[PDB]
Amino acid sequence: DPAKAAFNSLQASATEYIGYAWAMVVVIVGATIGIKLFKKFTSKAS
Amino acid sequence: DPAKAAFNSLQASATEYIGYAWAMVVVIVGATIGIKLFKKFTSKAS
Amino acid sequence: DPAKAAFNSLQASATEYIGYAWAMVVVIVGATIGIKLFKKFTSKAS
Amino acid sequence: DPAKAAFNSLQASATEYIGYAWAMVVVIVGATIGIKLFKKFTSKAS
Amino acid sequence: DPAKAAFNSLQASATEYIGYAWAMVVVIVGATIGIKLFKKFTSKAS
Amino acid sequence: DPAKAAFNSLQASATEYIGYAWAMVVVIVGATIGIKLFKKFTSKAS
Amino acid sequence: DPAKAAFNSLQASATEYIGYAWAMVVVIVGATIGIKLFKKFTSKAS
Amino acid sequence: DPAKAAFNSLQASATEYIGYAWAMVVVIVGATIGIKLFKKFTSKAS
Amino acid sequence: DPAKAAFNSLQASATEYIGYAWAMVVVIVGATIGIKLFKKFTSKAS
Amino acid sequence: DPAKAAFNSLQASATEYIGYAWAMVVVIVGATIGIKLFKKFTSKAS
Amino acid sequence: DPAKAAFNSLQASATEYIGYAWAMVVVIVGATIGIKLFKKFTSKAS
Amino acid sequence: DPAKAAFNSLQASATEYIGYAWAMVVVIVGATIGIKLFKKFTSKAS
Amino acid sequence: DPAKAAFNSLQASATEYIGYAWAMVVVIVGATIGIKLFKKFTSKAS
Amino acid sequence: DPAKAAFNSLQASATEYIGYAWAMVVVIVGATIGIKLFKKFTSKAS
Amino acid sequence: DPAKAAFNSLQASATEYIGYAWAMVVVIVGATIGIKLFKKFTSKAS
Amino acid sequence: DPAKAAFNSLQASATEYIGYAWAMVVVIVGATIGIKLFKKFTSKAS
Amino acid sequence: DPAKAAFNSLQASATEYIGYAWAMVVVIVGATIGIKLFKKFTSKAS
Amino acid sequence: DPAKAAFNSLQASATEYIGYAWAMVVVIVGATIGIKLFKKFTSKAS
Amino acid sequence: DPAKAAFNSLQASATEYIGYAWAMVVVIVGATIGIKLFKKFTSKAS
Amino acid sequence: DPAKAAFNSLQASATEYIGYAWAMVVVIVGATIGIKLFKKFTSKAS
Amino acid sequence: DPAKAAFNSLQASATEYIGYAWAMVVVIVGATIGIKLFKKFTSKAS
Amino acid sequence: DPAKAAFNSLQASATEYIGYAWAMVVVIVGATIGIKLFKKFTSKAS
Amino acid sequence: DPAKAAFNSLQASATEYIGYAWAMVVVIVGATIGIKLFKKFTSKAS
Amino acid sequence: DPAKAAFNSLQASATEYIGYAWAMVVVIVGATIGIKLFKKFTSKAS
Amino acid sequence: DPAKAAFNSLQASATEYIGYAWAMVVVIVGATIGIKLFKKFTSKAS
Amino acid sequence: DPAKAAFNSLQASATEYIGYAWAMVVVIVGATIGIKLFKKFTSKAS
Amino acid sequence: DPAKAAFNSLQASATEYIGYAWAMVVVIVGATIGIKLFKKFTSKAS
Amino acid sequence: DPAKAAFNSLQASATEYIGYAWAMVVVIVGATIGIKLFKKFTSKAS
Amino acid sequence: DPAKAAFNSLQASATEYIGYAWAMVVVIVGATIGIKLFKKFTSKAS
Amino acid sequence: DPAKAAFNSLQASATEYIGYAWAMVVVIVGATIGIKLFKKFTSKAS
Amino acid sequence: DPAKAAFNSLQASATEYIGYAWAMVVVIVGATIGIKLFKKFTSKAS
Amino acid sequence: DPAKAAFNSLQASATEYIGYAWAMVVVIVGATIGIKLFKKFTSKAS
Amino acid sequence: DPAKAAFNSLQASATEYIGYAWAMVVVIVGATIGIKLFKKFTSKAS
Amino acid sequence: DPAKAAFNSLQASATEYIGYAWAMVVVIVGATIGIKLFKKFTSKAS
Amino acid sequence: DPAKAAFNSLQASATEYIGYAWAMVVVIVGATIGIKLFKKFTSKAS
Amino acid sequence: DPAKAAFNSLQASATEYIGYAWAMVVVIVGATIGIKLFKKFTSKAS
Amino acid sequence: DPAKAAFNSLQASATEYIGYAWAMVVVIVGATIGIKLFKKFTSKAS
Amino acid sequence: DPAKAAFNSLQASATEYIGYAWAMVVVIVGATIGIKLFKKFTSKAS
Amino acid sequence: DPAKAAFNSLQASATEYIGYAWAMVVVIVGATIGIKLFKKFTSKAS
Amino acid sequence: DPAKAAFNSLQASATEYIGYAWAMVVVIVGATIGIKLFKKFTSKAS
């Protein structure tokens, strides 16, 4: 049954895309929150 | 009749295909909602 | 029903995100208030 | 989970930022309080 | 008539989906409003 | 003439589909509008 | 015309949401003004 | 209607938040007014 | 109108707040003037 | 002409929905603006 | 056209809110100015 | 316009405040001048 | 050509909406500035 | 030729269908834009 | 242009507020200077 | 060639539609900015 | 081009608003500074 | 009006102070005059 | 005019003290001149 | 401006105060000098 | 009411501070008047 | 530029206030010096 | 390639829009900063 | 061969259709982008 | 609820903060009062 | 091969469009950030 | 009333100083008159 | 200059006071010297 | 760049404001110091 | 798999953009805090 | 059979088209995401 | 990549605005501190 | 409360200061009276 | 700087004030000394 | 907790200033008191 | 982490600002206390 | 670094202001002490 | 810490003024006592 | 405590000044008494 | 230092006034002693 192997391949590819997207979004959100917190804490500390 | 047996086989195949489709939808929607909630809660927490 | 398991998985995942968000909220709010109270009391006492 | 690690990394980054803010505000607050006390006491003494 | 039962089953599935969505949205909205009110009342109290 | 009965039969049998479709839309739309207003008013109420 | 009944149901449903929102506003607003007036009048009285 | 219960939980939570806010503001205000009165009265007596 | 009750409720609290402020300010002012008059009238007579 | 009779039926139905929609908008918008004005005017007066 | 009626109702609600806000602000301003004038004239007279 | 009534009430209130301030200052000044003249004339006559 | 007529009708409705909006803005801004100036001049005079 | 008369008959039918379609669009577009501008101006009016 | 009329009305209201504030400040300053001069001249003559 | 006339007519027909759109956009935008500046300049002038 | 004309009209409206705001702020600032100078010089003269 | 009651409270207390000052000043002045007259008359007579 | 009455009362009190002091000084001077003249006359006559 | 009228009013009030002060000081100085000259001349003559 | 207890707690403390201040001022004044009377009566008697 | 005209008006008003203040202080100081010199020279002459 | 000319035309229109926006920004910011500096320096100088 | 001539004729027809379509898309997109940038720069400028 | 611990952590920290403020203000007041009494008593005694 | 040539042509066209879009985005972003920074720094400097 | 005890205690204290002052002056005066009478009686006898 | 006018006015008033004081002292000294020389010459003649 | 020209114009305007403020403050300071020195020297001269 | 290469290139571009953004934020925030601290410390020192 | 050759040729052509489409998707997505993050980071940084 | 050039240009522009803002703020702060110090020193010296 | 301890410490310090001041005033007054009595008695005795 | 010119104007004004005060004081002192010397010489020579 | 260290450093620094203030006041007070007795005792001794 | 370096640079700039502010305040306080002590000791010496 | 130059210019301006203040206070104090010593020595010598 | 150096500098300067004040008061008291003793001894010896 | 050291130092200095005060007075008194008996005894013996 | 020059100038002025006062007192004392000795010697001659 080729459909079985095709679905496994599609699910594996989707999981790989999920992993890469998670890495990218983690990097972007980390940068954004870092900048926001830096500005906020610098304004409040001074 | 062979037509009835073919119909039963097609119903079983359709159920199996719906099984893979449901699994793929679950994983993809889980990833999407996880990313959305991560961004939302991270932005609101800061 | 795969839908029943799917919705339950997202609800459990969302609860974890709320827990992580609440952990980050407390440390941020505690620092901001601690600085403001420190600046307010040191000016009143002096 | 990718999300669990990301939330913890942000909390560590936020906690690190609080340390810098406290160090900076202590230096700033000490200057304003010290000048206030210096001007107050130099006039009371005379 | 298969159409009657099919429509009724789809309507029941829709109602079940509405129930799950309502539970999830109540959880998320409760968390968000809790964080917002916590920040607001903490700022007003000090 | 069986033909005129056939045209009547489909038109008569059709109406139930519009009846059930209309009932299905109300519960689907009611959930969508219900969640939309719940998030809208709780956000402004806070 | 099920749509005529459906619109009336939504208008009745939306009216209830306004009732809950108004009850939530008055308790929150009263607490905000109550703290603000308490802080203002104690400073004036002293 | 799940929405009615959802609004009640938020209103109950909001009232709980108000009690904590009122309790906290009393302590902070009482300290500032106490210090203000202490410095004011010690100058008159001296 | 729900707002009409809210505005009347807030004004009722404000007048209640004013009474407490007036009660406290009389006690504080009376003490300050009494000490001031005691110091003034004692030095003049002695 | 079946089309001309049909077009009037849909056009008349469209006028009905606009009437019900306009009634719903007034209720929702009036509540939103009322709360916005209530929060704005209360803070200024206090 | 419902728009004109909605606008008129909104304007009436705004005027009523303005009236309540004016009453409250007159009360509060009168209280504060009375306290200030009392403490200034008592200081001057003695 | 409530502003005219508020200003008139405030001016009237300032008027009776001035009245009591004058009533108290007349008594205080009379007492002080009486003591001064008593001690001056007793010293001179004796 | 009915497109031009529709465009003109929408333009006229927009102009009417601008009229109502301008009336409401004048009322609200007048009330707010009146309250602000009343408080400012009252605090300055006393 | 019967053919040349036919297309004119269909063309004549095409003219009337467009006539009602244009009439239908204006009331729907007017309702959509009228509500959209109503929400915009009232929000900015406050 | 309703904006020009609004500006004119606001300027007129500001002028009336200026008049009321001037009257009140004249009364207050007159009373205070009268008390001060009464005390000074009574002390000097005695 | 009817194709050239058809495209030219459609291209020509788009010209005044842009004209009506541009005419309406200026009216709407001028209303929005006029209100926005009126609120901004009135607050700063006070 | 309509855009250039719209921009020029907006700039002209802004200039008129600036003129009105300048007149209002000159009036208000003159009044406040006159009151302050009156109080200061009246206190100094006595 | 609490202010009127407060003003008479101070004046009633201020009246008591004058009685206390007058009682003591007669004793002190009586002693000063008595010693002076004693020294004057014992020398002139002798 | 409170100043008129206060000054008149102060002048009347001053006149009363002047009268009492005049009586006392007449008594004292009479006694002193009498004893001195008595001593002188007895010394000379002998 | 009301400033000119206020300045004239306080100047006239001050002149009236000088009149009363001059009357009182003339009376007091006359009494004191009369007593002193009486005691000097009765001491010298005898 | 959270504020009703809060106001009373401050007033209860405020009265206590008055008791502490009145005890301290009596001690200070007793030395000031005692030293003044000691130097006054020693010089006269000696 | 309205700024130059506003500043010139403010400076002219300030200078006129200066003139009034000088006119008042001359009278007050003349009265004080006259009373002082009258008492001094009457004491020395007698 | 008409797209090249289209992109050039869009860039030119955007540049014209930037020019108009910059002119309007200069005017508005100049007016606002002028008002702010006028108020600040007028308050500081007096 | 008529086939080659037909292919060339339809190729030229397609080329001119692409030309007209390119012109239409250029003008429509230019209008849309002009309106969008007009609104954007007008909102940002004010 | 994470909010219950969050408010207690801040409220406990605020109570801790007041302790240092009360400790420092006693040290500051002790020096200011001590110097004031030292300069007062050495001047009176000498 | 027409296929590879067509694909390369589309790739080159996409690259050219990307370059032109990047240029336009650079212009728009530069203008917007320039205006934002101008307003921010002008407000902060003053 | 703390003031009642304070004045009464001081008046009692002043009485003690009067007693000591009266006691010491008799010793001093007795010496002065004693020596003067001693010298004058011996000179007249001798 | 107001200062110069005030200074010479005060100098003129001082000169008049000097003249009056000189006249009075001449009268008093004349009387005293006359009576003293009268007594001295009558005693010497005897 | 338009921004550089705008900054230069704002700086020039600020310098002009500084000049006006300097002139006004020189006038006011001269007046106040002249009055204070006049009082001081007329008090010292007598 | 071109997807992995595309994801890696996109993440690298994101990281480089983050670096440039961090540099820009550092510069801007440094300038802002520098201006704020300069104006704070200059105000405190004077 | 020619079937295998046809299938293999179609598969190879499909693979080549997939590769070309993948390259086109990579470049287009890279450009789009680059512009998106450029705008995001320039907006956040400012 | 145009992104690097765009970021560098934006950073250079931000540096230029920083320089202009620093110049303007130095000028304004210098003027304000000059006025403040002038008033303080002319009040102290005289 | 730390306020009670602070007040008690202040009162104890005041008592100590009173003791030292009493010692100094007794010794100084004793020396002064000794010198005065020495001079007086050596004058009278001889 | 205008500060140097203001300082020089204030110093010239002070020098003029000093000269006026010296003239007034020397006249007053000469008159006082002449009166004293006349009295002394009439007591001595006669 | 950085705050506990920060408060202790401020309290420790405040104690250091009190040491310098007490050292300086003793030197100043000793000079002023020493001069007063030098002038007091020299006049009494001689 | 560029944020750590940015925080360090900001703290260094703050330390430099503190040094400059300390120098300026030392100079200003030295001048003020020098003038005060000069005036006080000059008055005491004479 | 513009901050260093700004601070240096501010300190230089402060030093020049200190010099001017010293120049003025020397003259004022010299005049006051000259008048005081002139009066003292002319009263003692005569 | 510059504060300690500033305190030491002020103490040294204060010692310097104390030295000059002591020299001046020694000169003044020497001259005064010399004149008084000269007059006393010339009166006694002659 | 620094206060105890200061008071003892002042008392030690005060006792020190008394020693020189008694040293000088006996020298002056012995001279005045010595010259007095010298004039008394020689006249009586002769 | 300005203090050095000011103190030296004041000491020189004090010495000048001392010399002038010495000359005046020598003249006056010589005249008085001459008159008294002349009266004594002529009395002793007769």
Numbering used by the authors:
A (entry chain O), B (entry chain X), C (entry chain BA), D (entry chain CA), E (entry chain Y), F (entry chain FA), ...: 5 to 50
Authors' text:
Filamentous bacteriophages package their circular, single stranded DNA genome with the major coat protein pVIII and the minor coat proteins pIII, pVII, pVI, and pIX. Here, we report the cryo-EM structure of a ~500 Å long bacteriophage M13 mini variant. The distal ends of the mini phage are sealed by two cap-like complexes composed of the minor coat proteins. We further performed local refinements of the mini phage by dividing the particle into the top, middle and bottom three segments.
To determine the structure of the inner ssDNA genome, we performed further classifications using the middle segment by searching for the orientation among the five equivalent positions. After several round of classifications, we observed a right-handed double helix structure of the DNA genome in the middle segment. The two strands are well separated and presumably correspond to the phosphate backbones of the DNA genome. However, densities for the bases are missing in the reconstructions. The pitch of the double helix structure is ~28 Å for the top two turns and is ~31 Å for the bottom two turns. The pitch is consistent with that of the A-form dsDNA, which has a pitch of ~28 Å and a diameter of ~23 Å. The segment with clear double helix structure starts from layer 8 of pVIII, ends around layer 16 of pVIII, and has a length of ~140 Å. Analysis of the asymmetric density map of the middle segment showed that K43, K44, and K48 of some pVIIIs in layers 8–16 have significant asymmetric features and are in close proximity to the densities of the ssDNA, suggesting possible direct interactions of these Lys residues with presumably the phosphate groups of the ssDNA phosphate-sugar backbone. The asymmetric conformation also indicates possible induced conformational changes of the inner surface Lys residues upon binding the ssDNA. The asymmetric interactions establish a unique relationship between the capsid and the ssDNA genome and stabilized the conformation of the ssDNA, which may have been preformed in the genome-pV complex.
